[PDB]
Amino acid sequence: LFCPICGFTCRQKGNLLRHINLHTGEKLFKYHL
Amino acid sequence: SYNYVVTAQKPTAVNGCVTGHFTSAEDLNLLIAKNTRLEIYVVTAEGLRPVKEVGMYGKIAVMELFRPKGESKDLLFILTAKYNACILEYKQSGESIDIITRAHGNVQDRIGRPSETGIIGIIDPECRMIGLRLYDGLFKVIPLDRDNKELKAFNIRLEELHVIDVKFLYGCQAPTICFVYQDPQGRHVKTYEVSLREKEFNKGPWKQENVEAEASMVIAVPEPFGGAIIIGQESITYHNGDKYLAIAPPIIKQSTIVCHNRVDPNGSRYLLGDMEGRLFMLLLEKEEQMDGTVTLKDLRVELLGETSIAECLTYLDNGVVFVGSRLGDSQLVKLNVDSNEQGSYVVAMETFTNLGPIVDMCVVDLERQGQGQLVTCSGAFKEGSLRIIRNLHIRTVPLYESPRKICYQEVSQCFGVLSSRIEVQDGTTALRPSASTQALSSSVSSSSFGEEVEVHNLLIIDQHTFEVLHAHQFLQNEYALSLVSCKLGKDPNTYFIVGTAMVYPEEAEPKQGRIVVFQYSDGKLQTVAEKEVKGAVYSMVEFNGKLLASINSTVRLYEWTTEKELRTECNHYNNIMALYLKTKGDFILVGDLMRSVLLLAYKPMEGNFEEIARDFNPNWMSAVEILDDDNFLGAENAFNLFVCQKDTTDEERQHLQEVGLFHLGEFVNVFCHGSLVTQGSVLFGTVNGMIGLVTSLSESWYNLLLDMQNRLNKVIKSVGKIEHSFWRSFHTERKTEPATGFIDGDLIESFLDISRPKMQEVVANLQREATADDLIKVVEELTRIH
Amino acid sequence: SCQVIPVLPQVMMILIPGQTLPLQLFHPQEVSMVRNLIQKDRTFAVLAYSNVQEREAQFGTTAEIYAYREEQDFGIEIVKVKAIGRQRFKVLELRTQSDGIQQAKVQILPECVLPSTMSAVQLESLNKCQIFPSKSYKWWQKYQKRKFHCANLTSWPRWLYSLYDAETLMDRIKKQLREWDENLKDDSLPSNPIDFSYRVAACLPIDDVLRIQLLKIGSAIQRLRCELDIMNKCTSLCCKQCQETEITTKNEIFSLSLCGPMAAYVNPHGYVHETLTVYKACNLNLIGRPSTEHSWFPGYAWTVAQCKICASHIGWKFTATKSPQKFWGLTRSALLPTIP
Ligand SMILES: Nc1cccc2c1C(=O)N([C@H]1CCC(=O)NC1=O)C2=O
Ligand SMILES: [Zn+2]
Ligand SMILES: [Zn+2]
């Protein structure tokens, strides 16, 4: 489980969603992932 | 916006002088070219006798004389700083004198950058072509046939971009050009042959040569010698094909040689002047080859003497020399066959007043009759002085050091003058006696080998005798910027307040500075208060009993506490450097060098500044001033005046639109309120020495005078046929806009000179229909102000 | 003067002319856009978004593609490009095609080039000496004494006119840049004020709004003065979100390899990070374990770093097995300069 932006790593999901939501960007996933 | 501009004192700096038979083939003439003014004098035994004095619509820039074959007298070629070339002839019909215009044109290349070395103009000694260097890599040529009535020119593409100096060579079968150019290898002298039939260069008579690394002046020696002479600071070298003669005398090492002249027609003697005013004679010694030609044997240089800082040198017959100067009075020196006991051969016959440069000025009614006199800080280096101007009568007070600012204390009956003198580092040693070193009483502030430092002084000068009452020397490596005289707070004494910045060469922007407060009473100048600040105090104003200071990029307000110590009240970090600070009522005008005007207002109840308007238009300024609550007036680059007007939406209420432009044609150092004899009268000084005056007209008169101008421009004939609207168009070196909201005062005042027959056609159908008498009365009313 | 240019939407960064922008492209729309633009004029335009809503752009730069490549791995049309900013333009109107194609009508701004300060008051007699051999402290002290010799005629001193001169102002920036790279050859930088100012602006740690300010200053001298202002007065960097937690000071800024102190890099998923390399960092907690994977700097493993107050991602700590042993790379977006 990797953060697509910064490379943050986790073993579960909730931390991953929180970390991604913490990012202050446009999060254009559809144009990046 | 409506405004009126009148020149109360014609420019007096000398741009350049020429000698020749202009007025008549039988008498000698000397032509001086002050900024926009051309003065033709007839040389006589007693001295110059003025014969004509015309005013061109342009800065003279390049002036030369030439007598093409088939003419009796010498024609005069003038190329102005705006690139208006014109060939003129002098025509004296009976007792009436008038300069005819043989030809005129505008030799300007659309795409190009003006040469960083400056405009250069030269004429073939045989008068076959005129060579002009205006733009890097391009040499413009104007054939001098009788068919070029418009001065048609063609460009020859030079390969050596950086050309230091260039001349035509005497003695050749085709026009030859010799010039010193710099490339990465060094400085090289190179020669080309100009071909009109092919319109291009050809290999010169002798190849390029390497020269002194600074070789920066070229002199074309006439027959029988031929060839060229190259001058730097270190060596003087004569090149003529194979012949090469270099002499490196120690006497010229100290100062750069900046101007030159030919004394004898055969080139046996030359006059050279250097920056610090010394005058040398360069001698050429000749040998006659048996059954050959004359050749040069050796070069000698000897120091004739010391004159005013020489801008142009010309040799009037019978051993007279007219030393023109932009920094000091011009003069007529006399060259004797033997030196006076002091060891100098040069004595002074006559002196011509030169008010410029005017670095600061102030209006003061010394005698209290209600018509104030004017005091200006004129000149630089040893020429510095104070000029007292009254109704135009001028009086001089030399200082022998550069004055920078001035202010007037009515109660103390004295002038405060900031001054600067250069001292060598060999402790430091003074160069010559000065006003600051010869003061009746002196004080010193407390708190390499050949390098030249600047020592700064504050001088208290009595207003009647003009003797230096006191001289206060500032700290080492301190530069004084601002000088304001005022009484702060409820304090009843009057103070000389000085702003200074600590400048160390290793640094770039000064970090430390001081605001000092002096009190002049009982013949002593004692320091009352002193404030340390973290910056340079560029400008200072008396803001309603407080001290407004410009600490680097900051406007700070100091109140005067009862304990006599400046105390901060408010600050406003305004991004730009507040170099120019002006006040009126509650409004403060702040500006830096690159335009960027910014109008603030001091909110009394709150106690802090609030920005009211701003206008950022990158362009160099010289000075700014406030005409009234809503109109501000400044000087932009390329010798221009401009007016901004504070005003709907907020954006419209925070934009100082320009509502007037004008190409004054001079550098305006300082503006100051006051008149020497339309609401308001802002005088302004200039670098050339011209003093001008601006007033605020009413709409009706402004329309009337604009129409009268537009009418005059169709009657009055200008020298060289230069359209007035062209000379008054705004200018920024690649752009022009028509002048608006400015009535050229000289053109209007010239209405009086023209006679009745022209008067009638000027006044026809104007605006009851006006008549010549009514316009004469109106123009008299306008003339009254200056 | 006026033109119409297309805009790729995924690129969110204020590009400065002369700066090299690398990108990865994934979604079909931009793939078609780039394949259509490559054959045509390479006039990629990047808008400086004043509002983070992606619908308010006033100034931008016409980027130019100079490198193109395709990698059809992963079964899909990944394409990698490298462009460079060329000119600055003003947003006249946003005529979106409604397909996501943000077509912008704009105008190309000029560069107001002023003449030398002492070109009006110049003494014509000594004007020949204005040319002088080019070649240090004594040399600069002579340059100032020769070029502004006519400052006597005006009310300001030479050192005040030396604060607005292009060359003397270039030299100070050169010194303060060499203090950062320690291998910056004099000839690497450009030689004229426009290019020099644009290149310097691309290496400072300016966050977002002090770039749109620099990007909208037309006069080259103004840009040089503002850049030197930023470089001198501001010496500390803090977390953008916290705005009050210091991470580093300018003196720790350390360039690596051939690129300047700060350089643009692309992560595996196409995001763009303007990484700034530093010797030391503080207030950061590390997560993960040193793993090489797609390490930007060869031979160095990385661990993710985030400030210990708001946990926002700030950068990575790079280490290697062997010079320097440990250093840090901080993304420029997360950093906010502050006056000490
Ligand atoms: N393997 C992943 C996986 C997800 C996100 C990232 C990386 C990764 O390597 N980087 C950075 C950090 C490490 C580095 O220097 N290069 C990168 O692309 C990421 O953002
Ligand atoms: Zn992340
Ligand atoms: Zn944080």
Side-chain angles (χ1 to χ4, degrees), chain A residues 2-9 19 22-33, chain C residues 9-10 12 26-27 29-30 52 54 241 267 269 271 273 287 302 310-313 316:
Chain A
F2 274 10
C3 170
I5 318 178
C6 78
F8 179 79
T9 292
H19 163 79
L22 182 64
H23 277 297
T24 62
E26 182 65 26
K27 276 191 292 323
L28 294 174
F29 288 106
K30 72 222 192 182
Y31 284 169
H32 290 163
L33 262 172
Chain C
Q10 88 184 14
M12 292 214 68
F26 204 54
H27 192 279
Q29 293 179 356
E30 311 97 353
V52 298
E54 283 81 2
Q241 212 188 303
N267 80 310
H269 297 110
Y271 294 85
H273 299 311
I287 301 180
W302 58 261
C310 84
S312 303
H313 166 71
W316 303 270

Coordinates of all heavy atoms in Angstrom, one line a residue, chain A residues 2-9 19 22-33, chain C residues 9-10 12 26-27 29-30 52 54 241 267 269 271 273 287 302 310-313 316:
Chain A
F2 N 0.9 1.9 -1.1 CA 1.8 3.1 -1.3 C 0.9 4.3 -1.6 O -0.1 4.3 -2.2 CB 2.7 2.9 -2.5 CG 4.0 2.1 -2.2 CD1 4.2 1.6 -0.9 CD2 5.0 2.1 -3.1 CE1 5.4 0.9 -0.6 CE2 6.2 1.4 -2.7 CZ 6.4 0.8 -1.5
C3 N 1.4 5.5 -1.1 CA 0.8 6.8 -1.5 C 1.3 7.2 -2.9 O 2.5 7.3 -3.1 CB 1.2 7.8 -0.5 SG 0.8 9.5 -1.0
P4 N 0.4 7.4 -3.8 CA 0.9 7.7 -5.2 C 1.7 9.0 -5.3 O 2.4 9.1 -6.3 CB -0.4 7.8 -6.0 CG -1.5 7.2 -5.2 CD -1.1 7.4 -3.7
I5 N 1.6 9.9 -4.3 CA 2.2 11.2 -4.4 C 3.6 11.2 -3.8 O 4.6 11.4 -4.5 CB 1.4 12.3 -3.8 CG1 -0.1 12.0 -4.1 CG2 1.8 13.6 -4.2 CD1 -1.0 13.0 -3.5
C6 N 3.7 10.8 -2.5 CA 5.0 11.0 -1.8 C 5.7 9.8 -1.5 O 6.9 9.8 -1.1 CB 4.7 11.7 -0.4 SG 4.0 10.6 0.8
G7 N 5.1 8.6 -1.7 CA 5.8 7.3 -1.4 C 5.5 6.8 0.0 O 6.2 5.9 0.5
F8 N 4.6 7.4 0.8 CA 4.3 7.0 2.1 C 3.8 5.5 2.0 O 3.1 5.1 1.1 CB 3.2 7.8 2.7 CG 2.8 7.4 4.1 CD1 3.5 7.7 5.2 CD2 1.6 6.6 4.3 CE1 3.1 7.3 6.5 CE2 1.2 6.2 5.5 CZ 2.0 6.5 6.6
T9 N 4.2 4.7 3.0 CA 3.9 3.3 3.0 C 3.1 3.0 4.3 O 3.3 3.6 5.3 CB 5.2 2.5 3.0 OG1 5.9 2.6 1.8 CG2 4.9 1.0 3.3
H19 N -3.5 9.9 4.9 CA -2.3 10.6 4.4 C -2.5 11.2 3.1 O -2.1 12.4 2.8 CB -1.1 9.6 4.3 CG 0.0 10.0 3.4 ND1 1.0 10.9 3.8 CD2 0.3 9.7 2.1 CE1 1.8 11.1 2.9 NE2 1.5 10.4 1.8
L22 N -4.5 14.3 3.5 CA -3.8 15.4 4.1 C -3.0 16.2 3.1 O -2.7 17.4 3.3 CB -2.8 14.8 5.1 CG -1.9 15.8 5.9 CD1 -2.8 16.7 6.7 CD2 -0.9 15.2 6.7
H23 N -2.7 15.6 1.9 CA -2.0 16.4 0.9 C -2.8 17.5 0.4 O -4.0 17.4 0.1 CB -1.6 15.4 -0.3 CG -0.4 14.6 -0.1 ND1 0.9 15.2 0.1 CD2 -0.2 13.3 0.0 CE1 1.8 14.3 0.2 NE2 1.1 13.1 0.2
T24 N -2.2 18.7 0.3 CA -2.9 19.9 -0.2 C -2.6 20.1 -1.7 O -1.8 21.0 -2.1 CB -2.5 21.1 0.6 OG1 -1.1 21.3 0.5 CG2 -2.8 20.9 2.1
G25 N -3.1 19.2 -2.5 CA -3.0 19.3 -3.9 C -4.3 19.0 -4.6 O -5.3 18.7 -4.0
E26 N -4.3 19.2 -5.9 CA -5.5 18.9 -6.7 C -5.8 17.4 -6.8 O -7.0 17.0 -7.1 CB -5.4 19.5 -8.1 CG -6.7 19.4 -8.9 CD -7.9 20.1 -8.4 OE1 -7.7 21.1 -7.6 OE2 -9.0 19.6 -8.6
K27 N -4.8 16.5 -6.6 CA -5.1 15.1 -6.5 C -5.7 14.6 -7.8 O -6.6 13.7 -7.8 CB -5.9 14.8 -5.3 CG -5.1 14.6 -4.0 CD -6.0 14.0 -2.9 CE -7.1 15.0 -2.5 NZ -6.7 16.4 -2.5
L28 N -5.2 15.0 -8.9 CA -5.7 14.6 -10.2 C -5.4 13.1 -10.5 O -4.5 12.8 -11.3 CB -5.2 15.5 -11.3 CG -5.7 16.9 -11.3 CD1 -5.0 17.8 -12.4 CD2 -7.2 17.0 -11.4
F29 N -6.0 12.3 -9.7 CA -5.7 10.8 -9.8 C -6.0 10.3 -11.2 O -5.2 9.6 -11.8 CB -6.5 10.1 -8.7 CG -6.0 10.2 -7.3 CD1 -6.7 11.0 -6.4 CD2 -4.8 9.6 -6.9 CE1 -6.3 11.2 -5.2 CE2 -4.4 9.8 -5.6 CZ -5.1 10.6 -4.7
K30 N -7.1 10.7 -11.8 CA -7.5 10.2 -13.1 C -6.5 10.6 -14.1 O -6.5 9.9 -15.2 CB -8.9 10.8 -13.5 CG -8.9 12.2 -13.8 CD -10.1 13.0 -13.2 CE -10.3 14.4 -13.9 NZ -11.4 15.1 -13.3
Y31 N -5.7 11.5 -13.9 CA -4.6 11.9 -14.9 C -3.2 11.4 -14.4 O -2.3 11.7 -15.1 CB -4.6 13.4 -15.0 CG -5.7 14.0 -15.9 CD1 -6.0 15.3 -15.9 CD2 -6.6 13.1 -16.6 CE1 -7.0 15.9 -16.7 CE2 -7.6 13.6 -17.4 CZ -7.8 15.0 -17.4 OH -8.9 15.5 -18.2
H32 N -3.1 10.7 -13.3 CA -1.8 10.3 -12.8 C -1.8 8.8 -12.5 O -0.8 8.1 -12.9 CB -1.5 11.1 -11.5 CG -1.2 12.5 -11.7 ND1 -1.3 13.4 -10.7 CD2 -0.9 13.2 -12.8 CE1 -1.0 14.6 -11.2 NE2 -0.7 14.5 -12.5
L33 N -2.8 8.2 -11.9 CA -2.8 6.8 -11.5 C -3.4 6.0 -12.7 O -3.2 4.8 -12.7 CB -3.6 6.5 -10.3 CG -2.8 6.4 -9.0 CD1 -3.7 6.3 -7.8 CD2 -1.9 5.2 -9.0
Chain C
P9 N -4.1 20.1 -18.5 CA -4.6 20.5 -17.2 C -3.9 19.9 -16.0 O -3.8 20.6 -14.9 CB -6.0 19.8 -17.2 CG -5.8 18.6 -18.0 CD -4.8 19.0 -19.1
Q10 N -3.2 18.8 -16.2 CA -2.5 18.1 -15.1 C -1.3 18.9 -14.5 O -0.9 18.6 -13.4 CB -2.1 16.7 -15.5 CG -0.7 16.6 -16.1 CD -0.4 15.2 -16.6 OE1 -1.3 14.4 -16.7 NE2 0.9 15.0 -16.8
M12 N 0.3 21.6 -12.7 CA 0.1 22.6 -11.7 C 1.4 23.1 -11.2 O 1.8 22.6 -10.1 CB -0.9 22.1 -10.7 CG -2.3 21.8 -11.1 SD -3.5 22.2 -9.9 CE -3.4 23.9 -9.8
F26 N -0.3 10.2 -19.0 CA -1.0 9.0 -18.7 C -2.4 8.9 -19.4 O -2.6 7.9 -20.2 CB -1.3 8.8 -17.2 CG -1.5 7.4 -16.8 CD1 -0.5 6.4 -17.1 CD2 -2.5 7.0 -16.0 CE1 -0.6 5.1 -16.7 CE2 -2.7 5.7 -15.6 CZ -1.7 4.7 -16.0
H27 N -3.3 9.9 -19.2 CA -4.6 9.8 -19.6 C -4.7 10.1 -21.1 O -3.9 10.9 -21.7 CB -5.5 10.9 -18.9 CG -6.9 10.7 -19.0 ND1 -7.6 11.2 -20.1 CD2 -7.9 10.2 -18.2 CE1 -8.9 11.0 -20.0 NE2 -9.1 10.4 -18.9
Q29 N -6.5 12.0 -23.1 CA -6.7 13.3 -23.7 C -5.3 14.0 -23.8 O -5.0 14.5 -24.9 CB -7.6 14.1 -22.8 CG -9.0 13.6 -22.7 CD -9.9 14.4 -21.8 OE1 -9.4 15.3 -21.1 NE2 -11.2 14.1 -21.8
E30 N -4.5 14.1 -22.8 CA -3.2 14.7 -22.9 C -2.3 14.0 -23.9 O -1.4 14.6 -24.5 CB -2.5 14.9 -21.6 CG -3.5 15.5 -20.5 CD -4.1 14.4 -19.7 OE1 -3.9 13.2 -20.0 OE2 -4.8 14.8 -18.7
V52 N -6.6 28.2 -6.4 CA -6.5 26.8 -6.4 C -7.7 26.1 -7.0 O -7.8 24.8 -7.0 CB -6.2 26.2 -5.0 CG1 -4.9 26.8 -4.5 CG2 -7.3 26.6 -4.0
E54 N -8.5 26.1 -10.0 CA -8.2 25.8 -11.4 C -9.1 26.5 -12.4 O -9.4 25.9 -13.5 CB -8.2 24.2 -11.6 CG -7.0 23.5 -11.1 CD -7.2 23.2 -9.6 OE1 -8.2 23.6 -9.0 OE2 -6.2 22.7 -9.0
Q241 N 2.0 24.5 5.7 CA 0.8 24.3 6.4 C 0.9 24.9 7.8 O 0.1 25.8 8.2 CB 0.4 22.9 6.5 CG -1.1 22.6 6.6 CD -1.4 21.2 6.9 OE1 -1.0 20.3 6.1 NE2 -2.2 21.0 7.9
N267 N 8.1 11.7 -9.8 CA 8.0 10.4 -9.1 C 7.4 9.4 -10.0 O 7.1 9.6 -11.2 CB 7.1 10.6 -7.9 CG 5.6 10.6 -8.3 OD1 5.2 11.3 -9.2 ND2 4.8 9.9 -7.6
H269 N 4.6 8.0 -10.4 CA 3.2 8.2 -10.8 C 3.0 9.5 -11.5 O 1.8 9.9 -11.7 CB 2.3 8.0 -9.6 CG 2.4 6.7 -8.9 ND1 2.9 6.5 -7.7 CD2 1.9 5.5 -9.4 CE1 2.8 5.2 -7.4 NE2 2.2 4.6 -8.4
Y271 N 3.7 12.7 -10.6 CA 3.8 13.9 -9.9 C 5.1 14.6 -10.0 O 6.1 14.0 -10.2 CB 3.4 13.7 -8.4 CG 2.0 13.2 -8.2 CD1 1.7 11.9 -8.3 CD2 1.0 14.1 -7.9 CE1 0.4 11.4 -8.1 CE2 -0.3 13.7 -7.7 CZ -0.6 12.3 -7.8 OH -1.9 11.9 -7.5
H273 N 7.9 17.2 -8.4 CA 8.5 17.7 -7.2 C 9.7 18.5 -7.5 O 10.6 18.0 -8.1 CB 8.8 16.6 -6.1 CG 7.6 15.8 -5.7 ND1 6.4 16.3 -5.3 CD2 7.5 14.5 -5.7 CE1 5.6 15.4 -5.0 NE2 6.2 14.2 -5.2
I287 N 9.6 8.0 8.0 CA 8.8 6.8 7.9 C 9.3 5.9 6.8 O 9.9 6.5 5.8 CB 7.3 7.2 7.7 CG1 6.8 8.1 8.9 CG2 6.4 5.9 7.6 CD1 5.4 8.5 8.8
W302 N 16.2 6.1 0.2 CA 15.4 7.2 0.7 C 14.4 6.7 1.7 O 13.9 5.5 1.6 CB 14.7 7.9 -0.4 CG 13.8 7.1 -1.3 CD1 14.2 6.5 -2.5 CD2 12.5 6.6 -1.0 NE1 13.1 5.8 -2.9 CE2 12.1 5.8 -2.0 CE3 11.6 6.9 0.1 CZ2 10.8 5.3 -2.0 CZ3 10.4 6.3 0.1 CH2 10.0 5.5 -1.0
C310 N 2.3 18.9 11.8 CA 1.1 18.6 11.0 C 1.2 17.4 10.1 O 0.2 17.0 9.4 CB 0.7 19.8 10.1 SG 1.6 19.9 8.5
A311 N 2.3 16.7 10.2 CA 2.5 15.4 9.5 C 2.4 15.5 8.0 O 2.4 14.5 7.3 CB 1.5 14.3 10.0
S312 N 2.4 16.7 7.4 CA 2.4 16.9 6.0 C 3.7 16.5 5.4 O 4.8 16.7 6.0 CB 2.1 18.3 5.6 OG 0.8 18.7 6.1
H313 N 3.7 15.8 4.3 CA 4.9 15.3 3.6 C 5.8 16.5 3.3 O 5.3 17.4 2.6 CB 4.6 14.5 2.4 CG 5.8 14.3 1.5 ND1 6.8 13.5 1.8 CD2 6.1 14.8 0.3 CE1 7.7 13.5 0.9 NE2 7.3 14.3 -0.1
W316 N 12.4 13.8 1.8 CA 13.0 12.5 2.0 C 14.5 12.7 2.5 O 15.1 13.8 2.3 CB 13.1 11.8 0.7 CG 11.7 11.6 0.1 CD1 10.9 10.6 0.3 CD2 11.1 12.5 -0.9 NE1 9.7 10.7 -0.5 CE2 9.9 11.9 -1.2 CE3 11.5 13.7 -1.5 CZ2 9.0 12.5 -2.1 CZ3 10.6 14.3 -2.4 CH2 9.4 13.7 -2.7

